[PDB]
Amino acid sequence: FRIAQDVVARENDRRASALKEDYEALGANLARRGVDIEAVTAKVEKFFVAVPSWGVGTGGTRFARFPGTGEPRGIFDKLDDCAVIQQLTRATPNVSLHIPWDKADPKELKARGDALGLGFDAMNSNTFSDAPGQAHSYKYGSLSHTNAATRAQAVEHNLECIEIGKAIGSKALTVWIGDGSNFPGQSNFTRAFERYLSAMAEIYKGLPDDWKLFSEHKMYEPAFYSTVVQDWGTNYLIAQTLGPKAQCLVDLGHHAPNTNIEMIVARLIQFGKLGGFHFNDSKYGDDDLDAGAIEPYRLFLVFNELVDAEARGVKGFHPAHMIDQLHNVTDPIESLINSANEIRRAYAQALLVDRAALSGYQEDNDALMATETLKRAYRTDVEPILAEARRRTGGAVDPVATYRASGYRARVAAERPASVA
Amino acid sequence: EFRIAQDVVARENDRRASALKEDYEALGANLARRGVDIEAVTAKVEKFFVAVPSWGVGTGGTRFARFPGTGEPRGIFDKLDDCAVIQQLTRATPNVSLHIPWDKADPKELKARGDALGLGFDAMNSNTFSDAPGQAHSYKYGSLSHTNAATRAQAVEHNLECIEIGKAIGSKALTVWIGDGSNFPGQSNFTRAFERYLSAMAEIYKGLPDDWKLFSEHKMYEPAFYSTVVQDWGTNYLIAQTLGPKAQCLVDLGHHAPNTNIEMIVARLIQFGKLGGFHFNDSKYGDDDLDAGAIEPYRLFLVFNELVDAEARGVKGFHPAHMIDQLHNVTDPIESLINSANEIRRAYAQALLVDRAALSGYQEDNDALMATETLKRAYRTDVEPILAEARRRTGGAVDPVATYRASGYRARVAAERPA
Amino acid sequence: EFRIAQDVVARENDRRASALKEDYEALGANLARRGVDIEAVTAKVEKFFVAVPSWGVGTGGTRFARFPGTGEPRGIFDKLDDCAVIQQLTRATPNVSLHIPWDKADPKELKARGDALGLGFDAMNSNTFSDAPGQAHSYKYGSLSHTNAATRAQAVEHNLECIEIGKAIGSKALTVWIGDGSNFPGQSNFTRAFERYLSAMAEIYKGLPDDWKLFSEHKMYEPAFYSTVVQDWGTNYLIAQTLGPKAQCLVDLGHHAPNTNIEMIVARLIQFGKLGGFHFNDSKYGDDDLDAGAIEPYRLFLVFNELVDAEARGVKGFHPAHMIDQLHNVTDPIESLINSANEIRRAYAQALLVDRAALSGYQEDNDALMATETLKRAYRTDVEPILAEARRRTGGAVDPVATYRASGYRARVAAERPASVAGGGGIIGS
Amino acid sequence: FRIAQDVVARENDRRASALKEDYEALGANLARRGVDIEAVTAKVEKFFVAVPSWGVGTGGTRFARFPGTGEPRGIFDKLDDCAVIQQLTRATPNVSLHIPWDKADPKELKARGDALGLGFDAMNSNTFSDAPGQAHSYKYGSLSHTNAATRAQAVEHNLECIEIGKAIGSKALTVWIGDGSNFPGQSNFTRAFERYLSAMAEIYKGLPDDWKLFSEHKMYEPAFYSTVVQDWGTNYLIAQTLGPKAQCLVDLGHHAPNTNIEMIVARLIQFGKLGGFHFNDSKYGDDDLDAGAIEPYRLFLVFNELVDAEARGVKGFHPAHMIDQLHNVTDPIESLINSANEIRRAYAQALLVDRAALSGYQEDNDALMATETLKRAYRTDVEPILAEARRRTGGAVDPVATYRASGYRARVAAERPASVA
Ligand SMILES: O=C(CO)[C@H](O)[C@H](O)[C@H](O)CO
Ligand SMILES: O=C(CO)[C@H](O)[C@H](O)[C@H](O)CO
Ligand SMILES: O=C(CO)[C@H](O)[C@H](O)[C@H](O)CO
Ligand SMILES: O=C(CO)[C@H](O)[C@H](O)[C@H](O)CO
Ligand SMILES: [Mn+2]
Ligand SMILES: [Mn+2]
Ligand SMILES: [Mn+2]
Ligand SMILES: [Mn+2]
Ligand SMILES: [Mn+2]
Ligand SMILES: [Mn+2]
Ligand SMILES: [Mn+2]
Ligand SMILES: [Mn+2]
């Protein structure tokens, strides 16, 4: 137990009365609306989202990085920190690894995970930066580099990520590369994409029977003129071309200004290529901010599409849910805690939508009542449901408050040496 | 008079009275636990008013098509009758915003009708972005900033006429939004055009009553697709400052570049005393003029957070004009305006719930996470019980759209008005 | 038939012949030093054509207002007469794109008129984004994707009639752009709406002649302000791919999200054989429908660079349809279309000047700077002498707009046609 | 001479003939247009733009940095490379320094600049990153930080930049900070701006009589929710509030999508607050790409406003011009060379605009002819004028070609140790 149980007990007890009052009030209100709050809570306590190992330490921008105290010095410290998020929220049992950042002996990783009560989500490869001892630089590309030897090196790296993942329990590989160009003419758009397609086809061949291969699109950055996998259209072409095991991963902050992201989600589901999500919030570019901190409604609208998918009986639809954020000005553990909470919040509200009524308003083109039907769910304060879900599963009624009360940060600050060079 | 029968209102309120009582009491207990007196919030909410646009009462259209519904208002008088319904049911829209010459009519009559319906009039709106039949000079290439002196004079004269109409009905401000700009590089000399605009606005200001305000409204684009004279809040500030103390800037939410932090523009204008008022609506792409809060309700809340903070900081003489500027292309105009008015009160109400003392502490300590969570605790609060009770206590409807539909008002005016 | 007097064209050409000779010869010597035969370029340029929109010769407007100029064309016939002028002077717009029902008229008369004027017809354009007189079902909530079956059937039938009119006049394709979508979250079920659209398009597809094509045109927003069924090239690809071989995607330059790399979309559509054609225009904010290349000339060149690269390395009967889709609210429609057509040929000619061998080398080399400079060397080249000489050799004018004004054509049609009146644009009702 | 004169002479002679033909042809064409090419060339020779010291080294993104060979380490190495750009283009006589990146003994800096034939443009302060031993972190801001001591430290830093600048010949200080927030509520917009204005007032008082203080606005990054100096409106408020010596600096890539930047330029000029420019190109955000490599017409349109401003004889108009770019996939020296070249290209074309004709078409609302008047100048290939101006002032006809012919890159690569090589 990273967090003392007596502390979780104390803080939960301190807030029990208020929770009881709020939950019961919400329960009665929902009952009057024909909704069984217990049914919603039962589903909420089972919604899980993977935590990114690279989001447990303080992030930075191209301008600067401002680390806080007790920064994890490696993957093992990071797993320890992830154990806190899971213990308090009970919504993040799995961790997303990034190779070579989290490169370590597979058995050790697995041993630490089991010891902490954590599993492992999709593996993430890294061919957007050079590691020591590389025969080829990824400066001008990786899987789509004009140099065949460079593409071969990148492929091998991805295959290695699969080997690591199989050893620890992962069942998928997410591939995001920075490949693209910063000047018109630098790249032949089509040849670059063909090179990429050939490389991914090879990686596809090393995929176990029950594995998935996710390609993640991104409009720009690091490439500032064109990117090979720039949007969901190119992404669909990739998934369709590679095969059944290949699907598309949607990272919320990777779209052009004003893009209707929830529609992209609906389109990918309709064609069975919605592999998973990378949750975060943003206002300008790929800001990688705490989920829902900027546009909570958009997050709800995305979950509205996910729940509608179930409502329509979409077969074998099991998207992977993951947080992909950077925390530059907050305690990473606290931001990941509240971000996971926000995601469960959007999910819970999505479950409250009266889709029978909505179905009717859409059929009769009653736009005003249709939008009001969604709003009736989104406006509902489901915090009591999230808190009760946590209480029932061993978590904290108020996770960040309990986190601060434990003094975990000061503790790890004393155990961990700050990076000097 | 009462456009909506009172027995209907009473009936539809009693039908929901029990549920409301339960929700209001529960929220009240929750707010008490948070150190807030729900009664004090309701009191302020029932006092928050936003003006309804005359041009949003009838069905709107795009450059591609217009799909009118039944019972479309024939003119300003029908529109006032319909505005009376919005006010009767929401009790949040006692004033109507007129647009000339769309609403041209005998001022005395308009006032007589407003008085009979229990409606007042907000800022007048001039129109020199379109030509009227028998117009001597066309605004095709501009109006207040047109290169032709006679055309600028005509635009100025039209604005003065708007003021004369406003004085006859009780309006105390004039809002100036023009399409002036260019669609091609080189078409206009940016500086010269702005110089002409400033000179013309100077003449309008000269004719502005001393108990009136002059609001200029910036817009990034449309109808001008390359450059626009009053393109953003920066130019807008230069205008207000140049004209004088009676001139201020009006912020229309959908008139900003993609990803613009609009609440910051609001805060900046308040700091320098030039925030005249708002034109509320929502959008996702351009100046969509959609129902307020229907797309990004948190943004609306964040704008009101700046307004409330201004009061909390102790800003004096700050009374921004609140107006809705929307077009309803695929819904019953009355229903959209009803819920839009409600949404604005919703954001305002939530803004009132913000624990300013706690927020101040987190800001000073650079506790970004708790600062933002402090705003979220207010925003996440479902204040519908408060909005509904305020309505019920002031003669409105617990659920206005439901009551509106139960009344059969639309079918009624549909029979009274030509198809 | 010459809408513009031949002596006027001759006069205006002779007056600028001396200067053109000097510029053409200097550019010829420069290209020669660069290993390029100016005649080869001029020969290709003279053969590049782009269709003119019938709805473009009339003055356009916005939702706020419309400001018609003098001599506004009454109907399709007046518009065809005006299009004949653009073609006579630029020699780059022999085909006109029709829009139904705006230009509905006896096919035999249209066909007869086009021939007399030396004009053909490009793709037909259906209109189910507006209601017409006596229409049984309104398109307020959609057309091909409307929830009401009878409404979708009515829209399908309209499109089939467009195919019928086109078959009679010599058209070989149908372009389908609709406003279908929603203004509020929840109003539409994205998937169901798209399924209905696909099923409706399938019925229209069944009505296509063997040598016809069906072009679906995506647009991010407007008239729908929250979601649009055919919102981008991704959904557009799914459509074309689903319908069949005769279905392809049409790209309108101003229909993309801010900062989108449009030339890449073109390449992707080419790679997968679904590049149906283009709707050329320029913009800075949204679907501004401004004169092509008047705002971002380089972007137009880069789009043509992809086309020429494909045109170079011979591609699958690669013959995308080129059309101009613009609205002119502050200029003489005829003059803007003239210069817009010219700009399109300018970008094309410049793309022709790119040293493909050199470019390929720099790309394989990862020599970004030289690769981009290779494009710039072609783009920086002032090809106006080629464009002018191409027009002069084919019966056109050296300076089209100059000749147009010298002819007094506008004053002439102004006297023959009823005067127009300015007014609103539909933002509100009567 | 960083580049052997014999090399410059040989590469000039090699291209002298073609240059003569093109220059004469252009001279004849311009003559027919009532313009004397000699006059344009004379003006172009005198147009200068400052080269960034941080632009000669390879740039990178938050994802990775891919250094090239012969990466300059320290300001002395950087100055040596800047000298090559000036020698070959003759358009970058002055260098922009950034403190503390380029910290060194002022006397020694001046001596080096003099020896290399380089002057110094505006100084640049840095309170958007923490330096070793720093007493107060800038994690939550600097000049607008809530902590008084932190703001004072930031002020002191800027004052030191002024001291260094005065010793080396600089006459201005550019202030760009990352100050802002990543979360709504994190900052009180008004108070933060009040703190900034008060701090800037202190810096303003340390300004010599002949110095200027430039504030640089930016929409976002590093702050992803709000930025204190977010746009030109706030920037104007700052300059007007501070006084006559304070003006606004415009960095092309710092604006919202679709913003009409040339209008902002015109507005600042009209009110005497156009302090200077930070030239670069972009497509998505603050990409910092080579000037004009993405949107050359926009660059021309900006210069059209500058040339018009002089034509009108506006007073208080005397902006500084600087390049602020990052080169992640090209030889930094070649990019700066061609970027300085594009800037002169835009200036040259703006010089060709027939102002009289333009004025007439504007007054008569002939939009088509007015825009065509701009195009006639922009469509003109002024490369002959740029090449001749260089040839006449000791530069290279084709700078990048000569640079490559000289073998300079391999030279410094052999003198400088790479991290790994
Ligand atoms: O979103 C991403 C890049 O913008 C990818 O998912 C990365 O692998 C992840 O963010 C780690 O940098
Ligand atoms: O927002 C506006 C134009 O976009 C102005 O306020 C108008 O006067 C109003 O919308 C009426 O069209
Ligand atoms: O681009 C279009 C709508 O924005 C379609 O092509 C239309 O059919 C055309 O523009 C006519 O409005
Ligand atoms: O533009 C800037 C930051 O984006 C400032 O000018 C910086 O000081 C410069 O780029 C150095 O990073
Ligand atoms: Mn991601
Ligand atoms: Mn990302
Ligand atoms: Mn408005
Ligand atoms: Mn508007
Ligand atoms: Mn189109
Ligand atoms: Mn369009
Ligand atoms: Mn800068
Ligand atoms: Mn920058």
Q: CB-side exposure of B31: number of CA atoms within 13 Å?
A: 26
Q: Which residues of A touch C369 (CB under 8 A)?
A: 183
Q: How far is CA C28 from the centre of its chain?
A: 30
Q: Which residues pair with A246 in a beta bridge?
A: A213
Q: Which helix (H) or strand (E) holds A249?
A: strand A246-251
Q: Phi then psi for D231, rounded to 5 degrees?
A: -150, -175
Q: CA of C315 to nearest chain B CA: how many angstroms apart?
A: 36
**Hey, is the C-beta of B134 within 8 angstroms of any chain A C-beta?**
no
**Hey, is the C-beta of C245 within 8 angstroms of any chain B C-beta?**
no
User: Which tokens is A26 given?
Assistant: 């919400």
Q: Are strands B52-53 and D246-251 parallel, antiparallel or unpaired?
A: unpaired
Rounded Cα gap, residues D389 and B308, in angstroms: 60
Rounded Cα gap, residues C149 and C137, in angstroms: 10
C110: amino acid identity, one letter: L
* Cα R_g (chain C), whole angstroms: 22
Cβ–Cβ < 8 Å for B184, C294: yes
For chain C, list the contacting chains (3+ Cβ pairs, <8 Å). A, B, D
Q: Is C50 helix (H, G, I), strand (E, B) or coil?
A: coil
Q: Is A98 helix (H, G, I), strand (E, B) or coil?
A: strand
Q: Which residues pair with B227 in a beta bridge?
A: B182
Q: Which residues of B touch C286 (CB under 8 A)?
A: 221-222, 285-286
Alpha carbon distance, N-terminus to C-terminus of chain B:
25
Q: Which residues of D touch B272 (CB under 8 A)?
A: 237
Site of tokens 């390395």: C313
Residue of C nearest to A231 (CA): C234
The protein residue with its alpha carbon nearest to ligand 3, atom 12, reads B64
Q: Which residues of C touch A263 (CB under 8 A)?
A: 190, 227, 231
Distance (Å) of CA B266 to CA B44, B260, C387? 21, 12, 51
C336: amino acid identity, one letter: S
Total domains in the fold of chain B: 1
Rounded Cα gap, residues D138 and D19, in angstroms: 53
CATH code at position D214 = 3.20.20.150
* Cα R_g (chain D), whole angstroms: 22
Cβ–Cβ < 8 Å for C189, A309: no
The protein residue with its alpha carbon nearest to ligand 2, atom 8, reads B177
Q: Which residues of D touch C299 (CB under 8 A)?
A: 295
Q: Which of B102, B177, B323 to mutate to test the pocket of ligand 2 (most atoms within 8 A of CB)?
A: B177
Rounded Cα gap, residues B297 and B282, in angstroms: 9
Helical segments of A244-392, H only: 261-270, 296-311, 332-352, 355-363, 367-378, 383-392
One-letter-per-residue 3-state SS of C291-356: CCCCCCHHHHHHHHHHHHHHHHCCCCCCCCEEEECCCCCCCCHHHHHHHHHHHHHHHHHHHHCCCH
Rounded Cα gap, residues C374 and D338, in angstroms: 13
Q: How many helices (H) and strands (E) does chain C have?
A: 15, 11
Question: Is residue B72 exposed (0-12), middle (13-18) or buried (19+ Cβ within 10 Å)?
Answer: buried
The protein residue with its alpha carbon nearest to ligand 3, atom 8, reads C177
Q: Which residues of B touch D183 (CB under 8 A)?
A: 368-369, 371-372
Quick one: CA torsion of B380, B385, B391, B392, rounded to 10 degrees?
Answer: 180
Residue of D nearest to C18 (CA): D32
One-letter-per-residue 3-state SS of D179-244: CEECCCCCCCHHHHHHHHHHHHHHHHCCCCCCCEEEEECCCCCCCCCEECCCCHHHHHHHHHHHCC
DSSP per-residue letters across B183-232: SSTTTS-HHHHHHHHHHHHHHHHHTS-TT-EEEEE--SSSS-SSEETT-S
Residue of B nearest to A22 (CA): B30
Rounded Cα gap, residues A215 and A203, in angstroms: 12
Rounded Cα gap, residues C65 and B76, in angstroms: 20
**Hey, is the C-beta of C425 within 8 angstroms of any chain B C-beta?**
yes
Cβ–Cβ < 8 Å for A292, A302: no
The protein residue with its alpha carbon nearest to ligand 1, atom 10, reads A324
Q: How far is CA B385 from the centre of its chain?
A: 24
Give the domain extent around B362.
Answer: 1-419
**Hey, is the C-beta of C22 within 8 angstroms of any chain D C-beta?**
yes
User: Which tokens is C383 given?
Assistant: 């090809």
Rounded Cα gap, residues A92 and A113, in angstroms: 13
Ligand-binding annotation for D157, yes or no, is no
Query: Which one of D140, D260, D270 has the shortest CB-CB distance to B191?
Result: D270
Contact assignment for C268 to A233 by CB distance below 8 Å: yes
Residue C168 CB neighbours (<10 A) = 14
Rounded Cα gap, residues C87 and C52, in angstroms: 9
Determine the distance separating the centroid of ligand 12 and the alpha carbon of C358, expressed in angstroms. Answer: 33
User: Which tokens is C225 given?
Assistant: 């302000």
DSSP assignment letter at B29 = H
Q: Which helix (H) or strand (E) holds C109?
A: helix C107-117
Angle at C189 between CA C184 and CA C194, to 5 degrees: 115
Residue A112 CB neighbours (<10 A) = 18
Say if ligand 4 is within 6 A of residue D388 CB.
no
Cβ–Cβ < 8 Å for B139, B146: yes
Cβ–Cβ < 8 Å for C419, C70: yes
Rounded Cα gap, residues C14 and C202, in angstroms: 55
Residue of A nearest to C268 (CA): A190
Q: Which residues pair with B52 in a beta bridge?
A: B96
Residue B245 CB neighbours (<10 A) = 10
Cβ–Cβ < 8 Å for D58, D103: no
Residue D78 CB neighbours (<10 A) = 24
Q: Is A105 helix (H, G, I), strand (E, B) or coil?
A: coil
Q: CA of D37 to nearest chain A CA: how many angstroms apart?
A: 31
From the CA of C255, the nearest ligand is: 10
Site of tokens 């501009």: B142
Q: Which residues contact B273 (CB under 8 A, 6 or more apart)?
A: B248, B317
DSSP per-residue letters across D276-333: EEEE-B-SSSS--BPTTSS-HHHHHHHHHHHHHHHHTT-TT---EEEE----SSS-HH
Cβ–Cβ < 8 Å for C308, C348: yes
The protein residue with its alpha carbon nearest to ligand 1, atom 2, reads A176
Determine the distance separating the centroid of ligand 4 and the alpha carbon of D229, expressed in angstroms. Answer: 13
Rounded Cα gap, residues D172 and D278, in angstroms: 14
Rounded Cα gap, residues D343 and D50, in angstroms: 11
* Cα R_g (chain A), whole angstroms: 22
Nearest to A232 by CA among A251, A208, A258, A213: A251
Rounded Cα gap, residues D342 and D344, in angstroms: 5
Rounded Cα gap, residues C232 and C242, in angstroms: 16
Nearest to D253 by CA among D216, D213, D227, D225: D216
Question: Is residue B382 exposed (0-12), middle (13-18) or buried (19+ Cβ within 10 Å)?
Answer: buried
Q: Which residues of A touch C298 (CB under 8 A)?
A: 184
**Hey, is the C-beta of D225 within 8 angstroms of any chain B C-beta?**
yes
Q: Which of A125, A138, A176 to mutate to test the pocket of ligand 1 (most atoms within 8 A of CB)?
A: A176
For the stretch D241-250, what's the b/e string if a residue is b when 16 or more beta carbons lie within 10 angstroms of its beta carbon?
ebeebbbbbb
User: Where do the DSSP E strands lie in D83-156?
Assistant: 94-98, 119-124
DSSP assignment letter at B299 = H
- Structure resolution, Å: 1.8
Contact assignment for A28 to B30 by CB distance below 8 Å: no
Ligand-binding annotation for D80, yes or no, is no
Residue C262 CB neighbours (<10 A) = 20
Q: CA of D32 to nearest chain B CA: how many angstroms apart?
A: 22
Percent helix / strand / coil, chain C, rounded to 5: 50, 10, 40
Helical segments of B274-367, H only: 297-313, 333-353, 356-364
Please tell me the experimental approach by which this structure was elucidated: X-ray
Rounded Cα gap, residues C172 and C166, in angstroms: 7
Q: Which of A216, A284, A327 to mutate to test the pocket of ligand 1 (most atoms within 8 A of CB)?
A: A216
For chain A, list the contacting chains (3+ Cβ pairs, <8 Å). B, C, D
Nearest to A299 by CA among A271, A316, A315, A321: A321
Nearest to A347 by CA among A392, A386, A391, A396: A386
Say if ligand 3 is within 6 A of residue C287 CB.
yes
Q: CB-side exposure of A407: number of CA atoms within 13 Å?
A: 5
Q: CA of B408 to nearest chain A CA: how many angstroms apart?
A: 16
CB pairs under 8 A between B and D: 151
**Hey, is the C-beta of B32 within 8 angstroms of any chain A C-beta?**
no
Question: Is residue B264 exposed (0-12), middle (13-18) or buried (19+ Cβ within 10 Å)?
Answer: buried
Contact assignment for D221 to A63 by CB distance below 8 Å: yes
